[PDB]
Amino acid sequence: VNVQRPLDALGNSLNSPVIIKLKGDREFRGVLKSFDLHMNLVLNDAEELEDGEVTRRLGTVLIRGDNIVYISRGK
Amino acid sequence: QRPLDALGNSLNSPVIIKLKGDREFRGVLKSFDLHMNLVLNDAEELEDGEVTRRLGTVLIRGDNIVYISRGKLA
Amino acid sequence: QRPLDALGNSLNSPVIIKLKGDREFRGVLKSFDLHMNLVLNDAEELEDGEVTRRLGTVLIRGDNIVYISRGK
Amino acid sequence: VQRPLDALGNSLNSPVIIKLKGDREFRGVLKSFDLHMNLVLNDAEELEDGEVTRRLGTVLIRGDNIVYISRGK
Amino acid sequence: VNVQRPLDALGNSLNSPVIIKLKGDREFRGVLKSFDLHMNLVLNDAEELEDGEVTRRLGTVLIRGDNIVYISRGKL
Amino acid sequence: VNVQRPLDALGNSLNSPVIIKLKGDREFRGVLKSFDLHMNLVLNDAEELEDGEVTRRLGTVLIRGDNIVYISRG
Amino acid sequence: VQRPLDALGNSLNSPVIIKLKGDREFRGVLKSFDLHMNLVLNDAEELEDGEVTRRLGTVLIRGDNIVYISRGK
Ligand SMILES: [Cl-]
Ligand SMILES: [Cl-]
Structure with a gap:
């Protein structure tokens, strides 16, 4: 998309x-359901992983962007 | 429906x-602001899944929050 | 909305x-700003639930605060 | 005289x-970025001391966690 | 002190x-000589402490507010 | 220089x-090619050192000022 | 009456x-500083345990890392 709008990738x-x-x-x-300019975001059916092992099923969760290192597409 | 708008719900x-x-x-969420500072009623601290201290009503500064999820009453 | 406006209580x-x-x-909350910087009179610094120091009047920077709860 | 973020544009x-x-x-291939250096890479790969450790495809990296950015091969 | 003006207590x-x-x-x-909006301070006759005992005498020093956890006066 | 513009030193x-x-x-x-008010900067023919021993040659690189502690002449 | 940043100017x-x-x-000799306290020292020297460890000549220091500034030497 826009080379100046990296958050669009989130919309994608x-x-x-x-x-x-x-x-x-x-x-x-989890499934991205929303986000804002601060990268705060809402995940649905989200699960906490450890070394590739599910360790906690939280359901819907709001993550503060400040803690995020990166966001990538997954299965 | 921006992220914070969820807290309202x-x-x-x-x-x-x-x-x-x-x-x-x-605890029971009673309020929050854009910075995600928030007030919880009947709150209690937990460690490894076991309550460690009941603090009743408490104000948490959003800066220290990693995530927030839905919970249940016992 | 009113977390701040609830500290006043x-x-x-x-x-x-x-x-x-x-x-x-x-201690006794005596004043605060929107950053959560606040003043405490008759303050006491604790450790493990044990009074470590009697500070009297103290100004704490909000930036170091995790939470604040209504004492007794 | 291009300031820091132009060299990024190039x-x-x-x-x-x-x-x-x-x-x-x-x-990965740099696709976009903002003033905060938040950026997106396509065909991203995380490394383990010069050893590919994970293929991420398209990834959005928050600038605050970045130390430096260098040109690739 | 004014309920919305904590830094006031520094002025006191x-x-x-x-x-x-x-x-x-x-x-x-040390002795508070001046402070600003960010809680940057200037102490006169300052001394660094450890375990309650002096570790070093610094004289007049300018402390950046950001590093401050709290500021205590006395007790009366 | 200008006792009020410390970044002027970078300019030099x-x-x-x-x-x-x-x-x-x-x-x-490396060689300083440019910088901004946040001290973000670009270096040409840059190299990452370790206890005085270069351990990486990055050529042109962009360093976020945020991580900088200090900058000296070489 | 004096303000921290101004006293620094002193x-x-x-x-x-x-x-x-x-x-x-x-x-080192304070040569310049801004409101963030990023500042410049001429004849700068880093110390460890109280003994010089390296002479860095002119150096620009980011205020963000600063704990305190004091009149020395
Ligand atoms: Cl929620
Ligand atoms: Cl001074």
């Missing part, structure tokens, strides 16, 4: 499964 | 707050 | 201030 | 190297 | 000895 | 070799 | 000691 993932990598190495998987 | 509901450093909280 | 009441690092304070 | 659609705090490393 | 400690706690469990004592 | 190093010292102690050396 | 061109987070320490 609305209702899709994403992978949230947090500072401290924590990982989160 | 949880006002007066039991939520679970996860803080930096792996500290966790549980 | 404790103005002149005993509060507990938990900080990053687990250091905690107890 | 790498648009070129492979780059992003080095994060905590020493984690990434490689 | 001017030219009065104070205790400054910094991030990293470090401490300093 | 444009196209000269500098030593960038980062948080965590990492260290970079 | 030390332009005199020796000052800059103490940083991590406990690294530098000494």
Whole structure:
């Protein structure tokens, strides 16, 4: 999309499964349902991963953008 | 429906707050602001899934929050 | 909305201030700004629930606060 | 005299190297970026001391965690 | 003190000895000479402390507010 | 120079070799090509050192000022 | 009446000691500084345990790392 609008890539993932990598190495998987300029975001049917192992099924969750390291598409 | 707008849909509901450093909280959300500072009623701290201290009503600065989820009353 | 506008209700009441690092304070909230910087009279710095120091009047920077709860 | 973020502009659609705090490393084609250096990479790959550790495809990296960005091969 | 003006209490400690706690469990004592909006301070006759005992004499020093955890005056 | 414009010093190093010292102690050396008010900067023919021994040659690189502790002449 | 940043101004061109987070320490002549306290030292020297460890000549220090500034030497 716009080379000045990197958050659009997030819009290109609305209702899709994403992978949230947090500072401290924590990982989160779920369906992106929204986000804002601060990258705060809402995940649906989100699950907390550890070394690739689900360790917590939270359901819907709001993640503060400040903690995010990266967001990538996943299955 | 921007992220914070979700918190509104949880006002007066039991939520679970996860803080930096792996500290966790549980209580009924009564208010919040854009910075995600928030007030919890009948709150209580948790460690490894077991309550460690009941703090009743408490104000949490959003800066320390990692995520917030839906919870249940016991 | 009103988290801040709910701290005022404790103005002149005993509060507990938990900080990053687990250091905690107890005392009478006397004033605060929107950044959560606040003043405590008859303050006490605690550890493990044990009074570590009697500070009297103290100004704490909000930036180090984790949470504040209504004391007793 | 192009300031810091222009040199970034000259790498648009070129492979780059992003080095994060905590020493984690990434490689991928730079697709976009903002003033905060929040950026997007396509064909992204995370590295383990010069050894590919994970293929991420398209990824959005928050600038705050970045240390430096270098040109790629 | 004004319920919305915490820094006021700093104004009340001017030219009065104070205790400054910094991030990293470090401490300093001295006489408050000036402070600004960000809690940057200037202490006269300052001293760094550790375990309650002096670690170093610094004289006049300018402390950046950001490193401050809390500022204590006395107790009356 | 201007006792009010410390970044003027950076201006004086444009196209000269500098030593960038980062948080965590990492260290970079290269030729300063440009910078902004946040001290974000570009270096040509840059190299990452370790205890005085270059351990990586990055050529042109963009360093976020945020990680910088200090910058010296080389 | 004096304000921190202005008092700093009182030390332009005199020796000052800059103490940083991590406990690294530098000494040199204050040559310039802005509101963020990013500043410049001429004849700068980093110390460790109280003994010079390296002479860095002119150096630009980011205020963000600064804990305190004191009149030294
Ligand atoms: Cl929620
Ligand atoms: Cl001074």
